[PDB]
Amino acid sequence: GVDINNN
Amino acid sequence: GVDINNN
Amino acid sequence: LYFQSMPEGLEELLSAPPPDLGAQRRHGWNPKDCSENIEVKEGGLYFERRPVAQSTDGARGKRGYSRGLHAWEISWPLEQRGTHAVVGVATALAPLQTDHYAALLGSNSESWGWDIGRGKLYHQSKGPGAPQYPAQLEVPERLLVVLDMEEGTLGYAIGGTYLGPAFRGLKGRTLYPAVSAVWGQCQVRIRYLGE
């Protein structure tokens, strides 16, 4: 459940 | 008279 | 296709066996001079950026250079680069955090960076009209950063090819190794070679 930048 | 390249 | 002659001394630096880990730590990432979202590891050999949304995060080396030749390898895994991975140098005053994803390194007058994803150069630049360097090449995991403070240049080598200055006019400044990163749990290694 992370964003485009693995955050 | 001479041309574009002085010839 | 892009190779340039190296500054005096670089060949010798590159020929020498790798420096001891103590030397690498002394010129490595500074735990007292990095983003609050970055953890420096192994005494400076590398750092890990914590997963933090909508944040760009930088680190400076422990030591600033104003004379002589300085070169260091950066090892930055391809799959840990994300949208904005920038490598270069900064003054002691460049900001090391911002509240969105950006090319933070190079976005002001205090820093100079190469975006290793897009190949663009940033100094005082929000992105548009940033030139391509070399004047795209794939930047492998390892790249060499070359700061010649006798001539006032920052340039890079990849795969044994030096690409010449990216930035010129740096004489008189005191400049630190620097990166800016956006990727959750990225690990960025620095190996200072000399001088």
Place this chain on the structure above:
Amino acid sequence: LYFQSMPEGLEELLSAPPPDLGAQRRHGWNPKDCSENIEVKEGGLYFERRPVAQSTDGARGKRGYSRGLHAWEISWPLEQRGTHAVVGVATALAPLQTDHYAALLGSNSESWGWDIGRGKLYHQSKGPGAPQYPALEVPERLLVVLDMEEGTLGYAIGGTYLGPAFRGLKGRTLYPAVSAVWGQCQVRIRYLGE
């Protein structure tokens, strides 16, 4: 804005006192290896291209280089350049005359040239899609730098070395060369070493 590190040895060559005219003549333009429309003067120091319509006309230096560092100044007056003034190197087999105005030097596989009027680089090129170098007004004086250890040809102007224009030259034997179109142009070559 464009400066690059120089190959080892070049700084020393540029620092030395200018070479005597004898040394310049020895590596200067070859009267036995130039266009029939070119007259080599003063034993090789310069040449004059006769006024001949619809002709491009080249010259080679007397000596070909296959190893070591070689650098020579070209002096080519701004008002004597015309439509196509190209400075570089050539094998012994590059053609030195053609029957129209063109970038003859660099138009084939036997020659490599920098168009000093337009700034483009020619190798096996008629002109279209020719890259710009550096990637600048070229003053009367330019430095041509042939590094046969690394296999590069590049140039300096006004104290600024611009790095390789052409790479991958290792193994060849290459001569100083230009191609010219201008009636009564005079092009000087001053070889510095090695």
